[PDB]
Each structure stands twice: as C-alpha cells, then as structure tokens.
C-alpha cells in the first residue's frame, strides 16, 4: 500500500538510474559533513566512487544499464545512523544552550 507508492517514488527519482543510493543524494549540510567524516573508510570510498561515477554519467547524459540500477530493497542507508547521532548531539548542545 504505502510501500507501493514509496517504490514508485524510488523508481521516479533517478538516483537508482545513476547507480547512486539514497544517502548519496542527501544535501551536504554541516551535520551531513560530520556524518560523512565519521564514516568507516570502506563506506566512504564506496560513496565517493558512486558519486564520481554518477557525475560522469550525468556529464555524458547517459544512464547506467538496467541490470546495474540500484534496487529499492537492496538500497542500504549507510549514513542514517551516523547522521542521526550527529543530529542528536547537536540537539543536546542546543538544549544545553537553551537553559
């Protein structure tokens, strides 16, 4: 039901077409930058290569072959725990600042 429309949006958004994953496309604010610098090196190198390949594909206005597109289930939110921890720590610092 909801998973149907979410899967629709996943296909509608093209980051699977470029071989990217959802966390690769997040906007790099300060929290995102801290989360990135907290990534383990394997995850970090995978991220940079994915983004480089995507930028290359967009440069030539081409898309990755259909079999190599990311799968909605296979997509893994590598950055989510680190980003959540960064956000939680920032929230605590703000809360201490409040009073």
């Amino acid at each position: 039901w909801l998973e149907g429309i979410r899967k629709w949006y996943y296909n509608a958004a093209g980051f699977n077409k470029l071989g990217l994953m959802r966390d690769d496309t997040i906007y790099e604010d300060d929290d995102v930058k801290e989360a990135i610098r907290r990534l383990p090196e394997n995850l970090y190198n995978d991220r940079v290569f994915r983004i480089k390949r995507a930028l290359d594909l967009t440069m030539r206005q081409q898309i990755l072959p259909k079999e190599q597109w990311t799968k909605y289930e296979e997509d893994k939110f590598y950055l989510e725990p680190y980003l959540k921890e960064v956000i939680r720590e920032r929230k605590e610092r703000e809360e201490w600042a409040k009073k």
Binding site: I5, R6, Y9, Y10, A12, A13, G14, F15, L18, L20, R22, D24, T25, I26, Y27, E28, V48, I51, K52, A54, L55, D56, T58, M59, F77
Partner: protein, 379 residues
C-alpha cells in the same frame, strides 16, 4: 622561477577566477547562461556607449536624436537594434538563470543568491529607465504609470513621486535623470557581478545532480571556456536574428510616434520582461496592495532558501517538485500573456488566479510537496 600566471597578482586573480578555477564536470548548458549574462552586459555597455555618442537627452531632441542614429549615423541602426534586442536577450538569460538556480537548488549559496536578487533589481531598473530614453509615446506613458505606482506608498508618496519626476509629471527633468541613471547603473551592475563571482568562488559551482563534486573537478580553461564560447556564438545567432531579420519583433510599434502628453496611446503596456509583474500588479485592485505584490514577486526569491524543506538540493531526483516547478514556469508565461492583454472580463480572473497560483506554488505547495517527498524516501 615561477609561473607568471600563478605569481603575478592581477594574473593570479584572473587565473583563479577563470583559468584554473575548479569546476564540476557535469554542469550542463543551463550553466552557460551566467557567462551569457556577462557577454550581454558587456555588449550592452559598449552598444549603449556608442549610442550615447549620438543621443541628446533633451525632450526637444531625444526622439530626433534616435532617428538620427537610425538613419544618418553609419551603421547606427545596427547598434540601436543591437541594444534594444540585447536588453530582451539579457532578460531572457536572467530568467533562465534564476530558473536554473531554483530548479537545481543553487539558492543554498546564500550570499550569491542575495547579490543576484540585487542584480536583478538593478537590471530591471536600468531597463525601465532606458526604455524612457527614446521618448516615444509608449516610453512616456509607461514611465507615467510605473512612476505613478509609487504614489500608493502611504505618507511620503506624492513627495517621493515628484522627487523622482523632478516636477509635477514626467518631463524633461525626468528624461535627463533617467539618462544619467541608465548610464551609471550598468557599471554598478558590473561591480556587483564581481562581488557575485567572489561569493560563488567561495563555495564553488553547483552541479545538476546537486551533490558535491569535489571528487570530480575539471579545469575551466581547457573545457568550459570553449563551451561558453559556443554558448556565446549561439546567443549571437539568436540576437543577430532578432537584430537583422526581425528588428521590431519584441517592440511595440507605438514607440515610433513622438511622445504626446495630451494623448494616451491605444494600449499602455510595459516591455515583455516586465509584463508578469505588470499583470501581478493589475490583479490586486488596491493600489498599495498592487505595489506590494509587485515587490513581493521578486523578493520571494530572497525567501526561497528558507522555504527549502527537501533533503536533496537539486530537483533532478524530485519528480513532484519538477512538476510544481514547470507549473510555476507555465504560470509565469500565463502572467506575461495576461499583462499583454487588456483588463477585461476574461483576463481579469485569469490574472488573479495566476497570481494566487504563483505565490501559492512558491510559498506553500513546493515546501509541502518536498516534505511529502522526504516521507516517501523513508526520511
């Protein structure tokens, strides 16, 4: 020894600015419109300086001076129509540029975006004052209405309006003032462009994907230089087609009758670029409300960064936001069309609906849709 390009101070600045500036490899043709704006500004400055060598700003001689430029001056017609159509090309490229900024989330570069809004205001003022200079019927009466719009401001109001007019109504003082201001403003625009480029270089350039491209950067000199030259050639193709094949396509014919303060032209409309704001103004009946709406139409670009609720910078991977963005573009086209058309029964309601939809799309629909998208992507 050292490389002169790196070492020498002025050459160092030029090198970092244009030669060896790290640029993303994937920026598309939409990014060429900034360099196209620069070329348009330079062409306008040269063209207007050469026009001013033959233009006298007195009301008795202004229209006769433009006729002298068109007829007697060697290749004067080429220059005059290059200027007139270059203004339209400037505004086309500005609209496309701001559209690119909205679509690809380039507004996150806060200072660059704000300096850009300031530049848009300056360019619009420059064009509005410049259109008065030929002193045709349309020039005089458009100036009358647009300056009379300022009377809606409470208190200062009439005082400010007459101060700008230099008198009770638009007259010789206003024409000369507009000539002087139209001369000086492009140079301020040129300086603000340098400020704009500085702020952008602080943060680099955004890519169509919207993801940081520090991993994939290419030197500007060996690539985007020839790309921008190709874009400039295409722009010259379009502009020269306008200048030569259809010289009076984007201009109202009623600017060729000398201005008569005692007779209103059959229709009073601003130039095509101002038409959407003219329609927005006409939509609201109250004068002060119309002026505030006209100001807000442009100032909403200031609020655009604050209204960004999506987790993805660009709309490339936001299909619903893409649909809303193209609805906004169609709405702007509709507003232009309404502004061209007279204020009668069919067009009044269309204009009101278009204005409401424009503000709604920018303020409420786009942020809510972005939030829905984030929820869809399991954020």
């Amino acid at each position: 020894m050292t490389n002169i390009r790196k070492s020498h101070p002025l050459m160092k600045i030029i090198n970092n600015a244009f030669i060896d500036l790290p640029a993303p490899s994937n920026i598309s043709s939409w990014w060429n419109f900034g360099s196209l704006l620069g070329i348009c500004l330079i062409l306008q400055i040269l063209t207007g300086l050469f026009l001013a060598m033959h233009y006298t700003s007195d009301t008795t001689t202004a229209f006769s001076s433009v006729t002298h430029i068109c007829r007697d001056v060697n290749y004067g017609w080429v220059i005059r129509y290059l200027h007139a159509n270059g203004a339209s090309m400037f505004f086309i490229c500005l609209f496309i540029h701001v559209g690119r900024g909205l679509y690809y989330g380039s507004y996150m570069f806060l200072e660059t975006w704000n300096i850009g809004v300031v530049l848009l205001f300056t360019v619009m003022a420059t064009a509005f004052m410049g259109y008065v200079l030929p002193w045709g019927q349309m020039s005089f009466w458009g100036a009358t209405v647009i300056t009379n719009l300022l009377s809606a401001i409470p208190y200062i109001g009439t005082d400010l309006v007459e101060w700008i007019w230099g008198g009770f109504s638009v007259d010789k003082a206003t024409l000369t003032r507009f000539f002087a201001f139209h001369f000086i403003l492009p140079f301020i625009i040129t300086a603000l462009a340098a400020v704009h480029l500085l702020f952008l270089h602080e943060t680099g350039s955004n890519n169509p994907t919207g993801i940081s491209s520090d991993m994939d950067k290419i030197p500007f000199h060996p690539y985007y230089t020839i790309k921008d030259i190709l874009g400039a050639l295409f722009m010259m193709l379009i502009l020269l087609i306008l200048v030569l094949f259809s010289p009076d396509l984007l201009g109202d014919p009623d600017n060729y009758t000398p201005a008569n303060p005692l007779n209103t032209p059959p229709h009073i409309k601003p130039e095509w670029y101002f038409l959407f704001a003219y329609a927005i103004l006409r939509s609201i009946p109250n004068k002060l409300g119309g002026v505030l709406a006209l100001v807000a139409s442009i100032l909403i670009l200031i609020l655009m960064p604050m209204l960004h609720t999506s987790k993805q910078r660009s709309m490339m991977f936001r299909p619903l936001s893409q649909c809303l963005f193209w609805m906004l573009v169609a709405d702007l086209i509709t507003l232009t069309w309404i502004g061209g058309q007279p204020v009668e029964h069919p067009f009044i309601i269309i204009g009101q609906l278009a204005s409401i939809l424009y503000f709604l799309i920018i303020l409420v629909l786009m942020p809510i849709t972005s939030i829905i998208e984030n929820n869809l992507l399991k954020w």
